Design a binder for this molecule. Structure first.
Ligand SMILES: Cc1cccc([C@H]2C=C[C@@H](N3CCN(Cc4ccc(=O)[nH]c4)CC3)CC2)c1
Ligand SMILES: Cc1cccc([C@H]2C=C[C@@H](N3CCN(Cc4ccc(=O)[nH]c4)CC3)CC2)c1
Ligand SMILES: Cc1cccc([C@H]2C=C[C@@H](N3CCN(Cc4ccc(=O)[nH]c4)CC3)CC2)c1
Lengths: 620, 620
């Protein structure tokens, strides 16, 4: 141990030391045991002392009022405020617990009548309990904000909440995150009780401050509560929050006619829309928000009327881009050999050694125009996604990768080799086959990026990705463990052996190439049938055949059959997740002369400047 | 039949003969029928006789009191104790039933009032009914110990249990196994009723004997009851037994703060810990104990902070050990042939016949140091596990094998060949390829022993083991049945045939090697296309192809697909069973300068010398 860095996490161990030492500070001091209990008979003596430390601190800086607030002794705490009036005017002062007063803690007890007596002792509710135990993180179980009625918001006690409001509680105060009361209601674990908490707290603003008047306010990172429920995936309240958002028109027996506001769902301007905030997460449960009556009908209108024409024609032109690129790359200039087959005895079989800048003929001019287009088209790829990563971060760019498929890397990786294949053409380098070789195969792989606009072959592409980054990768870290052994084991066998017959391997690098082919059974297999092989070979070849082909190959095809039925229900909305992610990027990049806006605008219908959308259906 | 040994088990047949003969002893003697029933009117005559044998024995040695204790005739048994006061002072005296008094048997009747009248007749409870029908084994349905209130413990009758205690019942008496009352409560089949039996029996000790005062006592093999529930897998009571073990600190609304004792869970010293006793069994249900709130959080702390660094670096060095071993074994010294290709006409193709102790050159010195390391490192393997089997038994060593994987054998089997490859190098033997051949391949197989510290490829290794010892082994005992037939059947066909064409087999041993390759379809297949083959061959080759490749191969890949979904839920805790078994051995072998101890020690916190651990969570 000499170079440990960022691999301790001893702060969680440190607060545990803060836990037990604080209990020792309880145990040594006598009056804190009387603060741990009622102990009212001895407590009458404790305040009738000379030097009873009424303002002393714990290990994290409590008082007896703080401990009585913990162990909810309402009778004993009545004695505390008698000779110590200043005692209510002190919060917690530790790094872990900063700003927490006893008025906060009785709210955490969530069934108290001391809170009346505490506010009878002029207790301010203007505290900000912003200790490090109160920040949202995967190391605390709660996240309650900074404020007393905000703390009361998370515990569902209408008797206390209304009693907080009637003593001057500013409801529209915010936290260090910029989040107010209403933001914290969304992130609660119990989705049930917050709806009554939301509906009751609506009734107390009624205020002339028309500036974002009670809930239209974002945080420092610009997140509004109606949009926040889509972020954290509130299935329950988003239906409930849509009620004042939805406006109805008329009904017809079992039929109705409604209208949607839509004004903070579609991308109006350059602002972060709701739809953009859907796919920009790793949270799983927020993706099934797309099965709601305002949501998918916007999606299943504009892709039906605009996307499928725009996707296929964009799909069509990319198909044209590669075939002419295939046309030129199969027609490369070529001469025969010049250097007379000099050095290797029967170990060369190439005879061409390709041409140079001597190029001018009335046939290459077709190829000259042909390879001219694919260079300039490759620049176009480097003018639409290269400007993205100047502002879409690095990890923020890779955040899109796993959700929507890793195609955005490979399309630049296509054009990256296209830069090479004209430079080395220009300077007349030796290796032209190798940079074209990736360049030919990486283009046709990007055709499956357009295998998304059809239901019949769309979702099949997804579980390919779920096995390349999934079960094939875990298979590779055992397959290589098998083949690195047997190949070296095979190599010593025919080491003492002439390679003119059974030249399946004669040297160690080709041996690994051979034994890998023995693993996948894509080759023939060694047999000479004229000379008996060495005595070890017949043992080791068959044993390799059993545990790899009969066992390990057929095991690998079995484990993927386990995958499909337990990913079958989820892949349908993944296919829906393809469309919307395709929709927003296609909508945002393409200009205003194209793409008429969704919905129906106002400005002629007496309904504002906004944009409405309807639906009608049988209620049955 | 002349040499039968240990293949009878006629003792179970023998006790059945003891059953029916005892019923005949009932049937012949007249008063035992009156002991089989009430028969009180004739029973008034039976004791008013001259030579009524009041102390006689059955076939296994009953009395009429014993039979009345069986057929629970409380009215008739009142007559028995009148003229026979000594009759209560006799237990059963057979080999099968030894030490069983009638006071025991009325407790087995579990709803009696004769037990008051029996103890009114000064019946001792100091009996030890240790007959061979009372030993724990897979040949009796119960195991109740030796004592009356111990017998009453298994029947849940608080009216009788308290009546046993108030007549001088030593609760802390033990059996021949060293097990007391409380041990027998754990091994009961009904997990429900014992909790009330445990909680009630706690209240009667209260005694000044601080020596293991009521339940801290082990048996002769050193097993304490709190540890015994982990041994026999009591899911129910281990949560219940943790209540006085767990100590709480404080709560916070829906949040709490507790603390665990832990003092008989982690390996404190050289004693048999709880965690050691988990994996040292074949019992299945005891392995799901690891899903409890004191248990896995110890596991999911110290492997997260210490194991994964220690496992990977141990995983790293073994990867270095084999590549230099690969480096030397591919660079063996070699000369060309000397003996002029003398004996076989075109049946040798080797031309090297490797070198001897003529070795000194400034290139082999690198290999000399290279093979020096792998010899000494092989000794290190034989210094850590060779000392284990001096005290970890033979079958006790193989008891670890099936649970954690059969890698402990193969790692010595690795170094076993490493001893050979330097001796035969020293004495210049002929065969160097063959002992290296196992030695190269057996090392790389042990790399998958380090394919356990990752979730992505860890559990995939387990069902490999569940098919090598599982479905491939049952496939081998039919595959060999197929291929031993057809190969001999094939051999006579091309027996009357020249081997210069279609030399797939020309002799019987190579034929089995060929037909095995025909089974797995890893070779090409016989075709000459110039001479018609014999008339039998076209029939027998295709029929072999159907029932093996089309039928038997594809059947074998189908039956393993049946396995995965019905082993899918269980393999997750098997992967957890990997970690803890890795944890204890890594912890015990590595010394005190490494591995800071788990939990938080006392000695400064007013809580003893012990070691505490906490958790905090939402109760919700
Ligand atoms: C993942 C995993 C976990 C545990 C074990 C294994 C397997 C690893 C190597 C296997 N052996 C089998 C074949 N053997 C050659 C042989 C030896 C004698 C013979 O008569 N025929 C063939 C060489 C290596 C054993 C088991 C894999
Ligand atoms: C496990 C098990 C249980 C019960 C039965 C079997 C099979 C065993 C041998 C099988 N036969 C089928 C093929 N037959 C050659 C043939 C004969 C006539 C023909 O027209 N074509 C091909 C040779 C042996 C029959 C069934 C296996
Ligand atoms: C190519 C291939 C190789 C191996 C296996 C398979 C298929 C055969 C078993 C199937 N599994 C999953 C479905 N399951 C049905 C079921 C039964 C009860 C229930 O409550 N729900 C669902 C039955 C077992 C799926 C996979 C295919």
């Amino acid at each position: 141990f000499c170079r440990w860095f960022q691999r301790r996490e001893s702060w969680a161990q440190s607060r545990d030391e803060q836990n037990l030492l604080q209990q020792k500070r309880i145990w040594e001091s006598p009056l804190l045991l009387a603060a741990k209990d009622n102990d009212v008979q001895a407590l009458n003596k404790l305040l009738k002392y000379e030097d009873c430390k009424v303002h002393q601190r714990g290990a994290m800086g409590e008082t007896a009022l703080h401990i009585a607030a913990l162990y909810d002794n309402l009778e004993a705490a009545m004695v505390l405020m008698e000779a110590a009036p200043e005692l209510v005017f002190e919060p917690m002062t530790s790094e872990l617990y900063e700003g927490q007063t006893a008025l906060h803690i009785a709210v955490v007890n969530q069934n108290m009548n001391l809170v009346r007596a505490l506010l009878a002792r002029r207790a301010s509710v203007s505290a900000r309990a912003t200790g490090t135990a109160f920040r949202r993180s995967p190391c605390n179980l709660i996240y309650f904000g900074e404020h007393p009625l905000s703390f009361a918001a998370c515990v569902n006690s209408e008797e206390i909440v209304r009693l907080l409001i009637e003593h001057g509680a500013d409801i529209r105060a915010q936290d260090s995150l910029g989040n107010t009361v209403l933001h914290i209601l969304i992130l609660q674990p119990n989705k049930t009780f917050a709806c009554q908490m939301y509906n009751l707290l609506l009734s107390y603003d009624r205020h002339g401050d028309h500036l974002q008047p009670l809930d239209l306010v974002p945080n420092h990172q610009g997140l509004t509560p109606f949009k926040l429920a889509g972020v954290e995936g509130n299935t329950v309240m988003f239906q409930h929050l849509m009620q004042k958002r939805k406006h109805t028109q008329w009904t017809y027996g079992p039929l109705t006619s409604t209208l949607y506001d839509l004004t903070e769902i579609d991308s109006s301007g350059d602002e972060q829309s709701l739809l953009e905030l859907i796919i920009t997460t790793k949270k799983r449960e927020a993706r099934q928000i797309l099965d709601q009556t305002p949501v998918k009908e916007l999606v299943s209108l504009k892709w039906k009327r605009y996307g499928r024409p725009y996707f296929c024609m964009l799909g069509a032109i990319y198909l044209l881009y590669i075939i002419c690129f295939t046309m030129c790359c199969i027609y490369r200039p070529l001469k025969p050999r010049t250097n007379n087959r000099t050095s290797p005895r029967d170990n060369t079989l190439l005879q061409q050694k390709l041409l140079q800048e001597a190029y001018m003929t009335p046939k290459d001019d077709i190829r000259l125009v042909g390879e001219l287009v694919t260079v300039i088209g490759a620049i176009i790829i480097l003018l639409v996604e290269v400007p993205d990563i100047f502002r879409m971060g690095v990890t923020r760019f890779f955040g899109q990768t796993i959700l929507g498929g890793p195609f955005h890397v490979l399309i630049i990786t296509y054009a990256f080799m296209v830069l090479v294949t004209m430079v080395m053409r220009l300077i007349s380098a030796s290796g032209e086959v190798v940079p074209m070789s990736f360049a030919l195969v990486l283009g046709w792989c990007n055709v499956m990026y357009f295998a998304r606009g059809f239901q019949m072959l769309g979702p099949f592409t997804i579980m390919i990705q779920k096995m390349i980054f999934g079960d094939l990768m875990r298979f590779c870290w055992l397959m290589a463990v098998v083949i690195l052994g047997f190949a070296s084991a095979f190599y010593i066998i025919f080491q003492t052996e002439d390679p003119e017959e059974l030249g399946h391997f004669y040297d160690y690098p080709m041996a690994l190439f051979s034994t890998f082919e023995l693993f996948l059974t894509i080759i023939d297999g060694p047999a000479n049938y004229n000379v008996d092989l060495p005595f070890m070979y017949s043992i080791t070849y068959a044993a390799f055949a059993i545990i790899a082909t009969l066992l390990m190959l057929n095991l690998l095809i079995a484990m993927m059959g386990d995958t499909h039925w337990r990913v079958a229900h989820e892949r349908d909305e993944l296919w829906r997740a393809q469309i919307v992610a395709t929709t927003v990027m296609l909508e945002r990049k393409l200009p205003r002369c194209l793409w008429p806006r969704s919905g129906i605008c106002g400005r002629e219908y007496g309904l504002g400047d906004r944009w409405f959308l309807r639906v009608e259906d049988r209620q049955d």
